[PDB]
């Protein structure tokens, strides 16, 4: 009941950052596929700064891989000999969405 | 840039993208030159979407200057970006409502549980009070002997 | 027209997992919409009684829903402290509207088709913009939970009922309680106004005298938990007749499309059709095995829809 109450009170805050979080996630899936990890971060960083300068709320604490997939999918992917790498995790996400 | 903005406005009209308490920054990173001077939250979102598309063009030019292999950036990429934006927004919002619905019901069951627990306290004392008078009357009558 | 529900039913739709809170008729399409307490809005085809789709965007129990004049937009209010606007073409939530603290009770769209009103436990009524979503003005003066709120037929006059035993009529331009009515024995729950088809029928049914303009004045009706239905004059503020005979609390009241009879629902597990003209028709119809929550009357079709606590929505023929 303590955990549920804590998540319930923060529900309003979570709904506020959906537009910002989805915009970053959508761009990563559509655009950052071809580039390496060095510039996938650079493209993400530039987009994040623009959102900050535009006063658009977005969650800077959660990872994109965590946001776009659940643990069950990640566990199932690891069962399919997917390397346990962030870039490999991102690639699997783009192969699904 | 105008073509990208109009595509963003038309495709994202279905999504909410409305913040009544939106605060306009003093230095708005204006990408679309015809954006209204006091832009709304929806207009700001589309402006960011256009900026994202133009970011890739700068990124690809950086590789070409460095001599790396580049891939063409086409409007189909922009269409994929807005398609993903529409799908992700609906998915993330829908899950949040379903999750909060289940949590709201769960807390409601808990607060009804504690209420019935308090009801058992009143039931217990009534049972205890009835027991005390029952044995006291039983002892008194059994002693009329 | 002498449309009257009959004891035989046509369809008993039961798809909700939680008690149904309100039922409405689509203005143009053959669509019947029901709102329940499971945060889901279900859409039915009353002609054939087939479940069509559900709108599960809400978080907590949905309280009241309303359409517009064109039947294009659906406004919803729930206990999640928000007002949701639905686009009926594609059936998606297009604008979520916040504020108006605590459980929101009722919501309605004025025939202007541009502004929305709402009522909640916070003892106030808020007026919104459908286009933008910003509450320009707020109505204050109710000292308790405002239950049910309806506008007029031209978006100028608004009546609100509350637990404070007062039914206050508000004005769009002046934002003042033109008429305050504090005379009900117990809590007022449901209110509805009078269409133009019934203004003439009131004059000789009550003996009311026409004013200098000759127009009988706006009319009000309020249903309360005191098992009494009382119809009121907005222009003056005095009673004309009190309808008594409900066994339990009344929950929904509205006028017949022909403006001749009275149809109402109450917690007496039965629907009562009453005549105010001569007190001749006192038809009592058993509707549900449990408490009956709300009802509606189709503008032209001879159909009536009732919602109840038993997770079942029923449609009756009119004859």
Torsion of CA B102, B103, B109, B115, to 10 degrees: -160
What φ, ψ does residue C124 adopt, rounded to 5°? -155, 160
Q: Please judge whether B20 and C39 are an interchain contact, meaning their C-beta atoms are less than 8 angstroms apart.
A: no
Q: Where are the alpha helices (DSSP H) in chain C?
A: 199-206
Count of other CB atoms within 10 angstroms of residue C76: 24
Distance between CA C99 and CA B21 in Å, rounded?
Answer: 11
Residue C173 near chain B (CB below 8 Å): no
Chain B residues closer than 8 Å to A31 by CB? 52, 56, 77, 81
| DSSP structure class, residue C15 | -
What is the resolution of the experimental data for this entry, in Å?
Answer: 5.0
Mutation for testing the B interface, residue in C59, C61, C132 having most B CBs under 10 Å = C59
Q: Please judge whether B20 and C134 are an interchain contact, meaning their C-beta atoms are less than 8 angstroms apart.
A: yes
Return the CA Rg of chain A.
15
Please give the full DSSP string across B60-124, using - where no structure is assigned: HHHHHHHT-------HHHHHHHHHHHHHHHHHHHHHHHHHHHHHHHHHHHHHHHHHHHHHHHHHH
**Which chains lie within 8 Å of chain A at 3 or more CB pairs, if any?**
B, C
Structure tokens at B32: 């679309």
Distance between CA C140 and CA C118 in Å, rounded?
Answer: 12
Residue B45 near chain A (CB below 8 Å): yes
Nearest CA to A62 out of A27, A14, A30, A4 is that of: A14
Strands C92-97 and C104-109: unpaired
Nearest CA to C130 out of C119, C117, C120, C147 is that of: C117
Q: Please judge whether C96 and B16 are an interchain contact, meaning their C-beta atoms are less than 8 angstroms apart.
A: yes
* Backbone discontinuities in chain A, residue before each (C to N > 2.5 A): none
Start-to-end CA span in chain B (Å): 108
Query: What order do you get walking across the sheet with C250-255 strand by strand?
Result: C250-255, C262-266, C270-274, C282-286
Burial of C89 (0-12, 13-18, 19+ CB in 10 A): exposed
Beta-carbon contacts of residue B127 (< 8 Å; ≥ 6 apart): none
Which region, left, alpha or beta, applies to residue C5 given φ > 0 means left and ψ of -120 to 50 means alpha? beta
Exp. method: cryo-EM
* Rounded (5°) CA angle B103-C313-C54: 50
For residue B21, give how far its alpha carbon lies from the nearest alpha carbon of chain A (Å): 11
Chain A residues closer than 8 Å to C96 by CB? 15
Which residues share a beta bridge with B128?
Answer: none
Half-sphere exposure of B58 (CA within 13 A, CB side): 10
| DSSP structure class, residue C270 | E
Residue B94 near chain A (CB below 8 Å): no
Distance between CA C31 and CA C24 in Å, rounded?
Answer: 9
Which residue of chain C is at minimal alpha-carbon distance from B96? C59
């Amino acid at each position: 009941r303590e955990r549920w109450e804590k998540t319930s009170e923060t529900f309003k805050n979570q709904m506020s950052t959906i537009a910002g979080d989805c915009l970053l996630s959508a761009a990563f899936i559509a655009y950052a596929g071809y580039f390496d990890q060095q510039m996938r971060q650079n493209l993400f960083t530039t987009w994040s700064h623009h959102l900050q300068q535009a006063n658009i709320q977005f969650r800077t604490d959660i990872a994109r891989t965590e946001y776009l997939s659940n643990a069950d999918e990640r566990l199932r992917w690891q069962a399919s000999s997917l390397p346990a790498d962030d870039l490999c995790t991102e690639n699997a996400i783009m192969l699904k969405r | 840039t105008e073509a990208l903005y109009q595509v963003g406005k038309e495709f994202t009209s279905k999504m909410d993208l409305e913040k009544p308490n939106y605060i306009v920054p003093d230095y708005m990173p204006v990408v679309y030159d015809k954006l209204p001077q006091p832009p709304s939250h929806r207009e700001a979102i589309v402006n960011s979407c256009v900026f994202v598309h133009q970011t890739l063009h700068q990124a690809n030019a950086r590789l070409a200057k460095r001599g790396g292999r580049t891939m063409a950036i086409t409007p189909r990429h922009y269409l994929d970006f807005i398609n993903h934006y529409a799908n992700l927004f609906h998915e993330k919002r829908s899950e949040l409502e379903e999750q909060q619905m289940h949590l709201n019901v769960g807390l409601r069951k808990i607060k009804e549980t504690v209420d019935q627990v308090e009801e058992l306290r009143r039931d217990l004392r009534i049972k205890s009070q009835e027991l005390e008078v029952k044995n006291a009357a039983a002892n008194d009558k059994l002693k009329k002997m | 027209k002498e449309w009257i529900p009959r004891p035989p039913e046509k369809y008993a739709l039961s798809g909700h997992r939680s008690p149904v809170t309100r039922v409405i008729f689509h203005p143009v399409f053959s669509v019947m919409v029901s709102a329940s307490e499971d945060a889901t809005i279900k859409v039915w085809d009353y002609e054939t009684g087939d479940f069509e789709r559900t709108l599960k965007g809400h978080t907590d129990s949905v309280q009241d829903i309303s359409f517009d004049h064109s039947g294009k937009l659906l406004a919803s209010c729930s206990a999640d402290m928000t007002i949701k606007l639905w686009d009926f073409q594609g059936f998606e939530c297009i604008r979520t509207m916040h504020g108006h603290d605590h459980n929101v009770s009722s919501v309605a769209i004025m025939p202007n088709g541009d502004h929305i009103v709402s009522a909640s436990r916070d003892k106030t009524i808020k007026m919104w913009e459908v286009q933008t979503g910003y509450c320009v003005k707020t109505f204050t003066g109710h000292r308790e939970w405002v239950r049910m709120v309806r506008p007029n037929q031209d978006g100028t006059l608004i009546a609100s009922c509350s637990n404070d035993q007062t039914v206050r009529v508000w004005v769009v331009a002046t934002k003042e309680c033109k008429a305050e009515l504090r005379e009900h024995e117990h809590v007022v729950e449901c209110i509805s106004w009078a269409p133009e088809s019934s203004y003439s029928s009131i004059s000789e049914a009550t003996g009311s005298e026409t004013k200098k303009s000759g127009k009988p004045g706006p009319f009000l009706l309020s249903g309360s938990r005191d098992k009494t239905i009382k119809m009121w004059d907005v222009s003056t503020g005095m009673c004309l007749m009190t309808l008594v005979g409900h066994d339990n609390w009344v929950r929904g009241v509205l006028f017949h499309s022909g403006g001749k009879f009275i149809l109402s629902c109450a917690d007496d597990k039965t629907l009562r059709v009453w005549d105010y003209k001569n007190k001749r028709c006192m038809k009592t119809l058993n509707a549900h095995e449990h408490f009956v929550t709300s009802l509606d009357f189709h503008k032209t079709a001879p159909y009536v829809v009732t919602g109840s606590v038993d997770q079942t929505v029923k449609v009756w023929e009119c004859r």
